């Protein structure tokens, strides 16, 4: 029953219904995410999980979009990088400069994801 999808050109077998983010986790790629939680219902609002699929005009939400057989998930493509950068810019646009006084400082997903993506 497993469909053959590709992550960055690497073939990976996934059960039908697997989200793009889960397949990327299978190959070892942790797509940046803020709203998606493994034990919480999929939301798709943060828009930080956007990733490019080969031969696809629009980036898809890896946290929600289920994989389709034959899809090549370009996790580190320019489209994906720019999408992540733009979404992080939007997230930080109104975020207060509270890092020195924020207890989450040093262990903030926002901080690390901004620093990495």
């Amino acid at each position: 029953n497993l469909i053959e999808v590709f992550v960055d050109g690497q073939s990976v077998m996934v059960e039908p219904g697997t989200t793009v983010l889960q397949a990327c986790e299978k190959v070892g790629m942790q797509i940046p995410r803020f709203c998606y939680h493994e034990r919480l219902s999929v939301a798709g609002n943060c828009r930080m999980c956007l990733v490019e699929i080969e031969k696809a005009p629009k980036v898809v939400a890896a946290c929600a979009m289920p994989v389709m057989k034959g899809w090549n998930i370009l996790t580190n493509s320019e489209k994906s990088k720019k999408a992540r950068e733009g979404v992080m810019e939007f997230l930080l646009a109104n975020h207060p400069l509270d890092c020195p006084i924020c207890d989450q400082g040093g262990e903030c997903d926002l901080q690390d994801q901004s620093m990495m993506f």
Binding site: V27, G28, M29, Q30, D112, M116
Partner: protein
């Protein structure tokens, strides 16, 4: 890419180093196990530990490889490998204005041939390697502690050796001498966990 932030990379030296690495591998298939050129144009030859003297002698005397200067001989302790200690030889060829690295592996017990015959500078470097890491060098003219204290026990640079050590010194009036006592720190060295939970470099990702 381009722009000042990115470091300019010279491909010509990369090609030259790759060609010379293949040259060395062909000349010495008995010992050369792997040849790598880093993206910053640094040729590295991995050699079986038995080939320390032959490979270095070739890289020193050969007309087309005149690496007659031992820049630095060091060791890297990786405890996750059976041969934890990795002996690295950094060489320099003035004739061809190039550098090369010979990397070999060794255990805590397996001896490694001394390269003093090849390079006289190897004496003190190998003494340091033995003193800090504990890699015994066979046929060494004088292998002894060079940097630690005379009565010191243990090899400090080993990854399993504590940073503060096991013993400390102080002067005791009763014995009228400097005595060694078990280490007691007034303030423990505060270990800081800094590694981020998010991957930083996708290019160097190890597949599960």
């Amino acid at each position: 890419d381009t722009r000042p932030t990115i470091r300019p990379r010279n491909d010509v030296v990369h090609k030259q180093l790759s060609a010379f690495g293949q040259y060395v591998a062909e000349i010495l298939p008995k010992y050369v196990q792997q040849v790598q050129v880093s993206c910053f144009n640094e040729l590295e030859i991995f050699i079986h530990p038995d080939g320390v003297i032959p490979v270095l002698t070739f890289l020193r005397d050969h007309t087309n490889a005149q690496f007659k200067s031992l820049a630095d001989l060091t060791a890297v302790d990786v405890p996750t490998r059976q041969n934890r200690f990795e002996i690295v030889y950094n060489l320099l060829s003035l004739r061809f204005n190039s550098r090369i690295r010979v990397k070999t592996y060794t255990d805590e017990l397996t001896p490694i041939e001394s390269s003093v015959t090849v390079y006289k500078a190897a004496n003190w470097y190998e003494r340091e390697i033995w003193d800090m890491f504990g890699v015994f060098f066979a046929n060494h003219p004088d292998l002894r502690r060079i940097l630690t204290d005379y009565g010191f026990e243990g090899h400090p640079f080993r990854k399993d050796f504590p940073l503060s050590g096991y013993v400390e010194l102080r002067y005791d009036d009763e014995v009228k001498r400097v005595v060694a006592e078990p280490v007691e720190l007034a303030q423990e060295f505060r270990k800081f966990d800094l590694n981020s939970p998010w991957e930083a470099f996708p290019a160097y990702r190890q597949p599960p």
